[PDB]
Write a protein that binds this DNA or RNA. Structure first.
Lengths: 919, 407, 408
RNA sequence: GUCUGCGGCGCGCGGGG
DNA sequence: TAGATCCCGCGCGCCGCAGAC
C-alpha cells in the first residue's frame, strides 16, 4: 500500500527496489507539470483467494494455460502440416450427402467424415438465397465432397437448420478446421448455431496472413498502383492484398491460380450450377488445395512469429462467437424498413411541395432576383322533355376530334409545355411510365434539391463546376460571398475551403445541421424537416444492405436444451435463432478483429432510424449476457509503457499520474477535462487525445481541429502549438520525443525501430513489409499505431485465455466470447451468472498485472486492478439503463433491466456453493 | 396574426363552415358551432369515406353496426350534473304527491357509441363463427355537455355535437398488446396521410387509473396540441359487467380454445380532424409567396374540378360544357358548375376563388374548343396552364385521383 | 307473406332477439337497430338517393342541421318530443305539470333547455340565407340532407300508463326554394322523379303508387305508399308548403329572404320532400321476397355483391389466390364476402341456400382447376345456372353487370 | 431533308465504410 | 492512426433512329 497508491497482492516476491535516484527523478518531475501534493481518496482494501497459479511466476502460469488450451488443436495442425495429399479424384460424385474419394477415385457414401483435421471450403449460389450448394474438403486420409442435396426440386422457403453441412461427430474430440475466410464456411457447417458449446475450433489463413507480413491501408494504394511523393519500394515483394490468389502466389511458389470467368455463383441460377458442376467443383478443389499449401507454409511461420502460445489460444477462442436473436431480428428489420420507407416518402412529398411552390416566381420574372434559383432555365415552350338534351351529343361534343399532333401526347416530345424547363425535366411522361402526379423523379442526390432546400452558409450553389458547393463563406469580383447573390463570376475563386476535395472531407454535414450554418431558412415549414429527416435516415440508408440479409438460422424444437424447458418463456410460438458475426480474427494491419456491421462504434442513439442495432441480441431463456468494458485500455497501456521506460513506480512519468488520479467528474482527466479546457471543443477532445497516443502528426491535428469548427489557419495547429508543445513534445534533440515533457512516447518509437518482435508483452512479431530493416521508410506513425493496437489485441487475448481457463477449471456454463470495441461479453447460464462476473474481475487482475510483470515492473495501482462495473443483462447495449428511439419504447421489445453489480459480486466465492445460496 | 384568424375568413366565407360570425375556436372544439357549410359537409363526408375504406374495408372481420342516438329509460344509474342539486331552496312543495326529481327514470342521449357496439357484440358473434379477432365500426354523432364556466352565463349546460368514428375490436387477451400497437401505428399512418406536414400528427402513451394502457393522438394546432383520437384497452371489464348472468354464452373461439375476449376501443373525432386538415392545408414571415390557397389532399378535397367558359363568340356553344359535366358526374368526379354566373369576373379572381375552395383543377372552354377541342387546364398545386384534349380528361382525372389514393 | 321476419332475424338483416322486433314497432322507430347487412343496405340506399337527388342536379347542396334546437324561450305550442333535449335526462313531453317552483317553467322545463328535432326542414330554412349567398341569389335551388329524426310513440302500452318512446327514423329530406310562379310545376316534376326513383329498384314497381292530398298549410300534397302486404303505409311525402313558413322565420327586416328569379326579386316558395329510408328499406326488402327462400334485391342495393369460397382441394396454396382476388375486388370497389376462410366445410347445398338468403349477386367457387388454368366457378343468384369463367375477367364481368343493372 | 422527339455507347465528378 | 476503392449515383458528350414542316 501507500507509495502514492498501490494495490494489495498475494503473489510475487518481496523485492521492492524502487531506487533512490529513480524516486528522486520521479518526485522532481512531478513537482512540475501536474501537482505533487494530493492525498486523494485511497480505495477500500480487498482480500481475495485467487486459485493456485502455475510455475514460479504468472508468466509461466499463462504460458502453461496457453499450451494446455492449444495442444489438442496444435497436434491437429501439425498432422495437417506433414500430411500427404492423394491425387484429386477424376470425377466428382452427384449423390446426396457426404462422399469420400479413396484411392483410384473410389467414391463411397458416408454420413459424416471421421477426421481430426481438414481444410474446408463452401460455395453458395445467391439466386436461392445464401444456402450452400457444394463443398469439398481434404484430410490426411482422403478427399470428401458434399453436393448440398439441392438436386431435388423441392420448396422450403428458408427458415431451416438442416440446410448447411455437417462436420461435428457425435462421439457417442478436437475437431480442428482450417480454411480461407473460415468464418464464412463455419456459417454453413451447422451445430455452431447450437446454444451449447462445441469443441471444434476454426483457424483462418487470413488471420495468419494479417499477422505475418500484413498490408497497411495506406500501403495498399501503392501496392495496387504498382501491381513529397518520394518513398522506398522494397516492401511490395513481401505483402499481398488478402486475396486467395495473391496470397498463394506470394507465400507458395507456383503458377497463378486461375479465376472462373462466368462467376455463376454471384450471378447465375441452379440450372447453370448443374450444367457447370464439374468445372465449379474443380475450381473449389483448386482453392482448397491453394489454401492447404498456404496453411502448410504459414503454420511454422505462425509459430515462429508468435512464439508465445497464448496468441494461438486467443485466436482459437476469438473464432467462436455467438449472437442469439430469438425471433425479434426479422421483426426488427421490418419495422426499420417500414420507418425508412415512410420517412423517405414524407421527405419526398416535402421536396415535391417545394418544387410546386417554386413555380410561382415565373409569374413576374421574380426568379431573376431570387438568390436561390436565379441560374435555372425557367424556359417555357409553346409550339321527351329531357331526351332532347339528356343525350344531345352525349360524348362531350364528340364532333371535337384529335387533328394534328398525336405525337406530343404519347411519350415526351411536347412534355408539359408552359411549365418551367427544370420542372419539365422533373416530371415523368404523361401516361406510359406509370405516371405519378407532381414533380416526381426528385431526390436528395440531384443538383436542384439543394437549390429548393437548405441554401445555407449565405450561398449553396451545389453545382458540379469542378468545385461542388462554391463559396468563400467568410468575411471580407463583387458578390463573392454576399447574401443577395447574382454574382458576376468574372474570375472563379475557391476561397475559404482551400483544400477543395484534397482533404478526406467525409460525412461532415450530418453534425453541422445542429447550428453549423446548415438550415433552410425562409420556408420555415418543410425546409428544415427534410434536413432533419435526412439526419434520421442517413444511417439506415447505407446500412440496411449489411444489417439486412444477415444469415439467421432457426434451431428446431428438438435441438433445444433443457434450459428452455421448465422456464416460463417456453413455446410461445417462439423461433430461436443465432447470428454468426462472420468476423475475421484478424483483418487489419494488427490482429484486431474486423467486422463492418458488428465491431463498429455505434449504439442506440436518438434521432436515428437504424440505431440500436446492437440491441435485439436476446439470449435464450435460462441464459444471460455478462459483459465488461475495459476502462481506458490504450491510454493506460501507453501510460504504463512510458512509466516503465521512466522508472518503477507508476506515478513517475506524469502521464500515468493524470490517468490514475484524474477522474471524469471533478477531475482534470485528458477526456473532457484537460484537453477541452486547453482546446475549444467539448467532448470531441476524447478523439483528439486518442489521436496522439495512437501516434498522429501535427498536420493531422490541425485538420482534425479544423473539422470541429470554422477557424483560419493561424489558429490551427501551426501557431497554436500548446498541445504539441506539451504532451508529445516531439523532435527533441541535444539530449543523449525523448524526455522534456509529461508523456513518454519515445519507447514506442524505440520498439518500432528495434527489429525485435516489437510486442513488449507477448512478443508477437511485426509484418515483414513494415520493418525498417526490410525496408527503410518514414512511416513512424503507422508503426506506433501498430504497437499500441498490438498491446490492445495482446490484452484481449490474455483476457480470453484467462476466462477460458477459469471456465474450464470449474463447472461454469459460460462460453461464446464476443469482443466489440474493447468490450467483452459472454453468454452464461443464470444459475452461475454472478460467478461468471467474478472471474471477469479476477481476469483484469492478472491481465493488468501481466502488463505490469514484463519490462521490469512488479507493482500496479490499486484503482486499475478491477473493472468499474460488470453488466449482467438479457441483451447487448452500451449501458444497462438505456432506451430505443424508433420503436415505441424498450418495453416493446423483451428488454428487462440488469444489474451492473460492482462490489456485490466480490462477496461470493468461485466454488459451486456460493454463501450457501446454491442448493 | 394570420394564423387561426385569417383562415376562418375564407372558411365561413367559402362555406367550409357555418357562417354566423362566430370567430370562436373553443366553440368549434366543443361542438356548439351552428354547423358546417356544404363544402365542410362534403369534406367531412370524404374524410368519413376514407376512414370507412381504410378501417372496415380492406380489412376482413370488421363489420358495420348502428347504435341508437338515445338509450332506454329505466335501469339507468347516475344523474346529470345540474340535475344533482338538493342543497336548499325547498320552500315550495305545493305540488300534490315516474315524475319526482331523482333522475325521473328518464332516458339519455349517448355520449359515446362504444356502448352500442358492446351491446351488439353477442348478436355480431354468429357471423364470424365465434372467431375472436374481429371488430365493429361506426360513424355517428355524439352529444356532450359543455359550459363557459362563468357563473351561469348560459344557465343550463350547453349541448355540443361531435361526429365520432369508433372501432371496437375484440381480440384474444394474449394478443391484445400487439393488436393495440398495430392499431395505433395504422391510425397514426392514416392520419399522417392526406397531410402536408405529417409531423404535426403526434402520438403519446397513457394509462388508466385501473392500470389499463392506451394511446392518445394529437394534432398540433397553432395554439397547441389538441386531442383527436384515443385508443383504450378496456380489458373486458365493461363487456363482462354488462353480461353478468353467465360466461358460457360469452365464450368465443381463438385458435382452439374458448375464452372471453379483450376489448380495445379506438375513437376518433371527425369534426376536430376535419378542422385539423383545414389548418394543415393552409400555410408566413418573409415567405414572399402570398397566394392564399387551401392545399387539401386530392383524396378528400370537397370539389375536384371547376368548369368554366371564356371568350365565347357563341353562348349557344356553351352546351359543350353540358354532357362533359355529365361525363365527369359518372364515376363520381365532383364538379363545381360554373359558366352559369355570367358575370364580368376576371380570370385572376376566378382562380383565387377556386384556390380558396380547394379545387384541384380549373377547366376552361374557349372559342378554340369547337375545332380540334383544347380546354385550358390549370392546376391548384402549381399555377401553370396546360392544353390537353377533351376526350382524355375524364380518365386523366380518374388516374390523378387514383394516383393520389396510394402514394 | 309470413315467416319473413324470421329470415330477417337470421342472417342479421334486422338486429334483435327472438320476435322482439315483431310485426309492429318496425313502422315506428321504437325497435333495436338493424344488423350489419341492414346497415349496409341502408347505406347503399342513401348513396343511391344522394346520387339521384344531389350530385345529378348541379343546384342542390348538402346542409348541416343539428340534432337539437336550443330555442331560447321556445313557444309552448309544439309536439315537444324532448322538452329537455339537453345532455342526458330527456323528460319526454310532460304535458301540464311543472306547477311547483322547482323545475318550473323558468330554468328547466317549458322547453327552455331545447328540443330534439323531429323534421329536417328547420335546418334547411335556417341555412336558406347562407345557401343563397353561395348560389349568388339564383332563386331555384334545393338543400338535401339524410339524417335521423325523433318522434313520439303512443298506445302500444309498454308498462301500465304509457311511457312513450323515441321513435328514430332515418329520413332523407329535400327543401326546394322555387319562385311562386310554376311552383306547382316543380311539385309535379319532383313527384314524377321521386316516384320513378322509387320504382327503379323495385322488382314489382306496380306496388309503388302515389296519391294526392289537400290541406290548409300547403297548396297541394302528394304521398307515396308502396301498398305493403297488410296495407298502404306511407314511405314518402311531398308538400307545397308555401313562402308563409319562410316568413315566420326572420320576422324582422325586409328584402332579405327574397332572391332573383328572371331578373326579378321574389320571396321564394318552398317544397318539402321527406322520404323514410328505414321504411324504404323495409319496402324494398319486402318486395324482394317471393319456392325457395331468396331475397331478390336490386344489384345496386344488395349489401354484398359477390362471395368467395373454396371447393375441396388442399387447404394451403388456395388462400393465396382467394386473398389476391379479394384484394383486387376491394381495390375496384366491389363488396365481397370472404367466405373462403370459413372452416368446418359446410354443406354445399346449405351454403348456396344461405348465400341466396343473404342476397349475394354471384357465388364464386375456387377449386384446383383455378391452379391448373385459372377458371373459377360462378353461380347466378336468380337464374341458378353455374358456369365456368376466367378468374382475371371476374372484376370486369361484375362491374359490367352492375352498370347494366343500373341502366334501364 | 432540319433541330425536334426516341435508343445505344462512352466520359467526367463525387460520397460509402 | 487508418483510410479505403470498387460502387452506385449523378452529371456531360457522340452516335444513330425517327418525323413533321
Amino acid at each position: 500500500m501507500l507509495s502514492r497508491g498501490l494495490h494489495e497482492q498475494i503473489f510475487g516476491q518481496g523485492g521492492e527496489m524502487p531506487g533512490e535516484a529513480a524516486v528522486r527523478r520521479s518526485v522532481e518531475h512531478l513537482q512540475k507539470h501536474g501537482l505533487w501534493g494530493q492525498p486523494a481518496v485511497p480505495l477500500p482494501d480487498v482480500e481475495l483467494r485467487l486459485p493456485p497459479l502455475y510455475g514460479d511466476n504468472l508468466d509461466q502460469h499463462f504460458r502453461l494455460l496457453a499450451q494446455k488450451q492449444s495442444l489438442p488443436y496444435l497436434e491437429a495442425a501439425n498432422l495437417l502440416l506433414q500430411a500427404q495429399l492423394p491425387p484429386k479424384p477424376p470425377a466428382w460424385a452427384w449423390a446426396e450427402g457426404w462422399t469420400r474419394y479413396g484411392p483410384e477415385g473410389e467414391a463411397v457414401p458416408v454420413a459424416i467424415p471421421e477426421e481430426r483435421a481438414l481444410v474446408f471450403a463452401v460455395a453458395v449460389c445467391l439466386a436461392e438465397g445464401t444456402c450452400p450448394t457444394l463443398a469439398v474438403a481434404i484430410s490426411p486420409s482422403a478427399w470428401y465432397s458434399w453436393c448440398s442435396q439441392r438436386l431435388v426440386e423441392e420448396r422450403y422457403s428458408w427458415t431451416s437448420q438442416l440446410s448447411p453441412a455437417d462436420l461435428i461427430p457425435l462421439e457417442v474430440q478436437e475437431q480442428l478446421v482450417v480454411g480461407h475466410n473460415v468464418s464464412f464456411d463455419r456459417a454453413h457447417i451447422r451445430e455452431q448455431y447450437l446454444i451449447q458449446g462445441s469443441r471444434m475450433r476454426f483457424l483462418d489463413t487470413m488471420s495468419m496472413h494479417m499477422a505475418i507480413s500484413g498490408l497497411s491501408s495506406f500501403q495498399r494504394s501503392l501496392w495496387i498502383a504498382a501491381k513529397p511523393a518520394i518513398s522506398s519500394w522494397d516492401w511490395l515483394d513481401i505483402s499481398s492484398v488478402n486475396s486467395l490468389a495473391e496470397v498463394h502466389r506470394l507465400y507458395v511458389g507456383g503458377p497463378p491460380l486461375e479465376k472462373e470467368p462466368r462467376e455463376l455463383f454471384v450471378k447465375g441460377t441452379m440450372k447453370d450450377i448443374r450444367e457447370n458442376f464439374q468445372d465449379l467443383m474443380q475450381y473449389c478443389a483448386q482453392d482448397v488445395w491453394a489454401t492447404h499449401e498456404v496453411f502448410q507454409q504459414q503454420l511454422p511461420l505462425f509459430l515462429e512469429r508468435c512464439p508465445h502460445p497464448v496468441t494461438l489460444a486467443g485466436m482459437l477462442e476469438m473464432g467462436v462467437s455467438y449472437l442469439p436473436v430469438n425471433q425479434n431480428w426479422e421483426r426488427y428489420l421490418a419495422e426499420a424498413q417500414g420507418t425508412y420507407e415512410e420517412l423517405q416518402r414524407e421527405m419526398k412529398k416535402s421536396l415535391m411541395d417545394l418544387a410546386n411552390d417554386a413555380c410561382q416566381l415565373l409569374s413576374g420574372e421574380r426568379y431573376k432576383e431570387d438568390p436561390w434559383l436565379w441560374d435555372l432555365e425557367w424556359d417555357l415552350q409553346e409550339f321527351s322533355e329531357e331526351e332532347e338534351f339528356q343525350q344531345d351529343v352525349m360524348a362531350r361534343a364528340c364532333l371535337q376530334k384529335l387533328k394534328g399532333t398525336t405525337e406530343l401526347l404519347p411519350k415526351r416530345p411536347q412534355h408539359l409545355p408552359g411549365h418551367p424547363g427544370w420542372y419539365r425535366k422533373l416530371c415523368p411522361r404523361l401516361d406510359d411510365p406509370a405516371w405519378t402526379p407532381g414533380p416526381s423523379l426528385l431526390s436528395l442526390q440531384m443538383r436542384v434539391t439543394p437549390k429548393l432546400m437548405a441554401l445555407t452558409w449565405d450561398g449553396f450553389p451545389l453545382h458540379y463546376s469542378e468545385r461542388h458547393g462554391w463559396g468563400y463563406l467568410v468575411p471580407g469580383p463583387y458578390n463573392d460571398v454576399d447574401i443577395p447573390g447574382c454574382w458576376f463570376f468574372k474570375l472563379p475563386h475557391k476561397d475559404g475551403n482551400s483544400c477543395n476535395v484534397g482533404s478526406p472531407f467525409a460525412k461532415d454535414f450530418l453534425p453541422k445541421m445542429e447550428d453549423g450554418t446548415l438550415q433552410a431558412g425562409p420556408g420555415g415549414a418543410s425546409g428544415p424537416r427534410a434536413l432533419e429527416i435526412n439526419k434520421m435516415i442517413s444511417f439506415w440508408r447505407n446500412a440496411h444492405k449489411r444489417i439486412s440479409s444477415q444469415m439467421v438460422v432457426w434451431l428446431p424444437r428438438s435441438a433445444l436444451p433443457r434450459a428452455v424447458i421448465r422456464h416460463p418463456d417456453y413455446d410461445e410460438e417462439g423461433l430461436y435463432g443465432a447470428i454468426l458475426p462472420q468476423v475475421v480474427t484478424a483483418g487489419t494491419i494488427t490482429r484486431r478483429a474486423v467486422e463492418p456491421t458488428w465491431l463498429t462504434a455505434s449504439n442506440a442513439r436518438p434521432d436515428r432510424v437504424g440505431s440500436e442495432l446492437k440491441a435485439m441480441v436476446q439470449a435464450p431463456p435460462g441464459y444471460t449476457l455478462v459483459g465488461a468494458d475495459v476502462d481506458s485500455q490504450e491510454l493506460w497501456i501507453a501510460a504504463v509503457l512510458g512509466d516503465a521506460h521512466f522508472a518503477g513506480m507508476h506515478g513517475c512519468t506524469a502521464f500515468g499520474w493524470m490517468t490514475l488520479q484524474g477522474r471524469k467528474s471533478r477531475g482534470t482527466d485528458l477526456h473532457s477535462k484537460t484537453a477541452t479546457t486547453v482546446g475549444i471543443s467539448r467532448e470531441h477532445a476524447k478523439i483528439f487525445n486518442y489521436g496522439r497516443i495512437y501516434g498522429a502528426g501535427q498536420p493531422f491535428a490541425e485538420r482534425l481541429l479544423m473539422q470541429f469548427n470554422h477557424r483560419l489557419t493561424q489558429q490551427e495547429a501551426a501557431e497554436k502549438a500548446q498541445q504539441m508543445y506539451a504532451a508529445t513534445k516531439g523532435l527533441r534533440w541535444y539530449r543523449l520525443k525523448g524526455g522534456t515533457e509529461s508523456e513518454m512516447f519515445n519507447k514506442l518509437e524505440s520498439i518500432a525501430t528495434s527489429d525485435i518482435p516489437r510486442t513488449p508483452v507477448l512478443g508477437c512479431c511485426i509484418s515483414r513489409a513494415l520493418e525498417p530493416s526490410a525496408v527503410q521508410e518514414e512511416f513512424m506513425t503507422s508503426r506506433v499505431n501498430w504497437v499500441v493496437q498490438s498491446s490492445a489485441v495482446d490484452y484481449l487475448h490474455l483476457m480470453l485465455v484467462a476466462m477460458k481457463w477459469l471456465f474450464e477449471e470449474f463447472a461454469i456454463d459460460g462460453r461464446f466470447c464476443i469482443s466489440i470495441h474493447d468490450e467483452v461479453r459472454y453468454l452464461v447460464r443464470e444459475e452461475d451468472r454472478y460467478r461468471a462476473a467474478l472471474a471477469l474481475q479476477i481476469t483484469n487482475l492478472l491481465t493488468r498485472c501481466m502488463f505490469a510483470y514484463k519490462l521490469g515492473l512488479n507493482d500496479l495501482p490499486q484503482s486499475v486492478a478491477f473493472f468499474s462495473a460488470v453488466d449482467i443483462d438479457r441483451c447487448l447495449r452500451k449501458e444497462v439503463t438505456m432506451d430505443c428511439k424508433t420503436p415505441s419504447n424498450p418495453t416493446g421489445m423483451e428488454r428487462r433491466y440488469g444489474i451492473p453489480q460492482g462490489e456485490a459480486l466480490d462477496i461470493y466465492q468461485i466454488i459451486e456453493l456460493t454463501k450457501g445460496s446454491l442448493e | 396574426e394570420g394564423s387561426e384568424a385569417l383562415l376562418e375568413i375564407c372558411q365561413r366565407r367559402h362555406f367550409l363552415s357555418g357562417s354566423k360570425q362566430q370567430l370562436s375556436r373553443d366553440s368549434l372544439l366543443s361542438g356548439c358551432h351552428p354547423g358546417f357549410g356544404p363544402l365542410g359537409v362534403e369534406l367531412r363526408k370524404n374524410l368519413a369515406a376514407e376512414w370507412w375504406t381504410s378501417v372496415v374495408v380492406f380489412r376482413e372481420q370488421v363489420f358495420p353496426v348502428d347504435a341508437l342516438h338515445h338509450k332506454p329509460g329505466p335501469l339507468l344509474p347516475g344523474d346529470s350534473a345540474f340535475r344533482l342539486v338538493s342543497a336548499e331552496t325547498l320552500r315550495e312543495i305545493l305540488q300534490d304527491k315516474f315524475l319526482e326529481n331523482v333522475l325521473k327514470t328518464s332516458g339519455k342521449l349517448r355520449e359515446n357509441l362504444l356502448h352500442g357496439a358492446l351491446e351488439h357484440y353477442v348478436n355480431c358473434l354468429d357471423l364470424v363463427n365465434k372467431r375472436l379477432p374481429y371488430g365493429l365500426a361506426q360513424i355517428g354523432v355524439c352529444f356532450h355537455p359543455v359550459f363557459d364556466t362563468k357563473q351561469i352565463r348560459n344557465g343550463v349546460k350547453s349541448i355540443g355535437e361531435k361526429t365520432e368514428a369508433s372501432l371496437v375490436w375484440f381480440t384474444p387477451p394474449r394478443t391484445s398488446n400487439q393488436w393495440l400497437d398495430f392499431w395505433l401505428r395504422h391510425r397514426l399512418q392514416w392520419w399522417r396521410k392526406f397531410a402536408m406536414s405529417p409531423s404535426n400528427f403526434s402520438s403519446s402513451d397513457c394509462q388508466d387509473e385501473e392500470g389499463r394502457k392506451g394511446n392518445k393522438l394529437y394534432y398540433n394546432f397553432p395554439w397547441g396540441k389538441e386531442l383527436i383520437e384515443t385508443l383504450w384497452n378496456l380489458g373486458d371489464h365493461e363487456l363482462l359487467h354488462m353480461y353478468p348472468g353467465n360466461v358460457s354464452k360469452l365464450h368465443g373461439r381463438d385458435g382452439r380454445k374458448n375464452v372471453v375476449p379483450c376489448v380495445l376501443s379506438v375513437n376518433g373525432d371527425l369534426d376536430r380532424g376535419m378542422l385539423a386538415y383545414l389548418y394543415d392545408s393552409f400555410q408566413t414571415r418573409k415567405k414572399n409567396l402570398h397566394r392564399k390557397v387551401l392545399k387539401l389532399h386530392p383524396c378528400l378535397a370537397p370539389i375536384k374540378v371547376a368548369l368554366d367558359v371564356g371568350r365565347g363568340p357563341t353562348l349557344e356553344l356553351r352546351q359543350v360544357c353540358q354532357g362533359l359535366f355529365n361525363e365527369l358526374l359518372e364515376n363520381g368526379i365532383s364538379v363545381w358548375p360554373g359558366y352559369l354566373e355570367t358575370m364580368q369576373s376576371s380570370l385572376e379572381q376566378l382562380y383565387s376563388k377556386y384556390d380558396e375552395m380547394s379545387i384541384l383543377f380549373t377547366v376552361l372552354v374557349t372559342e378554340t374548343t369547337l375545332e380540334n377541342g383544347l380546354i385550358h387546364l390549370r392546376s391548384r398545386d402549381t399555377t401553370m396552364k396546360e392544353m390537353m384534349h377533351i376526350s382524355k380528361l375524364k380518365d386523366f382525372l380518374i388516374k390523378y385521383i387514383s394516383s393520389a389514393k396510394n402514394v
